[PDB]
Amino acid sequence: TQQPIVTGTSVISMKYDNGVIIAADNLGSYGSLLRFNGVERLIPVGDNTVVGISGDISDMQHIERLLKDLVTENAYDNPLADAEEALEPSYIFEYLATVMYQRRSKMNPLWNAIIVAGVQSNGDQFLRYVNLLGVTYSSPTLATGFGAHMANPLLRKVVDRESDIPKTTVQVAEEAIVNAMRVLYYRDARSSRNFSLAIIDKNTGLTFKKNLQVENMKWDFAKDIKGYGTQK
């Protein structure tokens, strides 16, 4: 039986025609106290996948070594394996699924909400959710945690169904990711301004942008608003 201690909040993601965008705010929240800032959520695993983790920072670090060890293992028992039997999202995703399910059944789970986002060797976009419970599903738009409820319906306009992935470009997707971040900064008390955003591509590779800020933060309507509803 575990209770979470410090937790991360929210991961948002969606598909585009040449890859996937995965992003999340950087924050270690101990309940009311926002204790730890700049706590990297996105761990790149190889260079064709980024794995995003929200939830318990304790199990985050623990997974961080096990993924680094997953590549170290790939190097093992072979003459080459980093382009010869190159690594795929699919391996990580199921590795994580087996382990979190086994630990939940021993009644002392791994407490995360995970988004695996990358591009395959086939180049086909991969975007799938895994968690402490053991739930797995693949969707055009994904989000975890609070973003699941809030930010995802915004991303569902941009791409409804899975046959609408090629109509989104990298620019369209990213603009929407920023819009989803804007929503989350505003109306989640356990979101933070700071966020990191990894764009995975199949024709370019990993560009990983660190420490972006929300721009166009609107509060000029706030001066006009007065009272609790009635101002005597």
Partner: protein, 244 residues
């Protein structure tokens, strides 16, 4: 002779374990394997003999990796040689989890030599039948060891094992005398190749294949990686040039 072998942990009136010395006899029969320490890296070179034209070369190596920064190459019996690197691999993995920093190169020598030692300690299990040259680059710089199947390890500037070990050490002997510094990393690639040419004049029946790997601070970025391409061609041209 007779007496005090049959077991590997029975002393004789001369204080010497016979079985274990035959362990070293097994390592001689295997292939010519050398490693070179440099002041910024380490270079591993090997004679993987060509036993047929139906063999597929440079796809069966006696190079193996430990963590992602320690190179290994073995002399002796080939699958015994697999097994001992496997042990290395579990320790690498375990140490990296607990302390969240890589295995130091001195730390590694101590730990391996002790498993070799638990198997020379019991009458019931056999010892290993392989030597392992190893080393890399870590935070405390490059360091190179060669571990004997006897249970012993030492630092080296140049370490050699296998059949053509008499010739290879003679060439290495020039390498220490001539460069006190152990030589630069780049020239030591073409050097590693030369020694293996001159040492296959004692395994001259068969054909051979040179595969080279390295770990260097500013040229392989503190990590282990294979030497290939133009670099490989050059190591070949150089060796060739000077055997002739």
């Amino acid at each position: 002779g007779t007496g005090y072998d049959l077991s590997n942990s029975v002393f004789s009136p001369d204080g010497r374990n016979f079985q274990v010395e035959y362990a070293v006899k097994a390592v001689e029969n295997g292939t010519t394997s050398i490693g070179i320490k440099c002041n910024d890296g380490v270079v591993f070179a090997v004679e993987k003999l060509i036993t047929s034209k139906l063999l597929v070369p440079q796809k069966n190596v006696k190079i193996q990796v430990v963590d992602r920064h320690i190179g290994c190459v073995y002399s002796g019996l080939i699958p015994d040689g697999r097994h001992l690197v496997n042990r290395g691999r579990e320790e690498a993995a375990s140490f990296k989890k607990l302390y969240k920093t890589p295995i130091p190169i001195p730390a590694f020598a101590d730990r391996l030599g002790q498993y070799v030692q638990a198997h020379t300690l019991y009458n019931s299990v056999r010892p290993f039948g392989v030597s392992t040259i190893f080393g890399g680059v870590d935070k405390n710089g490059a360091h190179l060891y060669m571990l004997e199947p006897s249970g012993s390890y030492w630092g080296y500037k140049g370490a050699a094992t296998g059949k053509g070990r008499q010739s290879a050490k003679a060439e290495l002997e020039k390498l220490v005398d001539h460069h006190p510094e152990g030589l630069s990393a780049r020239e030591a690639v073409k050097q590693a190749a030369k020694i293996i040419y001159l040492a296959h004049e004692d395994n001259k029946e068969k054909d051979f294949e040179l595969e080279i790997s390295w770990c260097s601070l500013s040229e392989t970025n503190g990590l282990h990686k294979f030497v290939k391409g133009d670099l490989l061609q050059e190591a070949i041209d150089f060796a060739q040039k000077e055997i002739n």
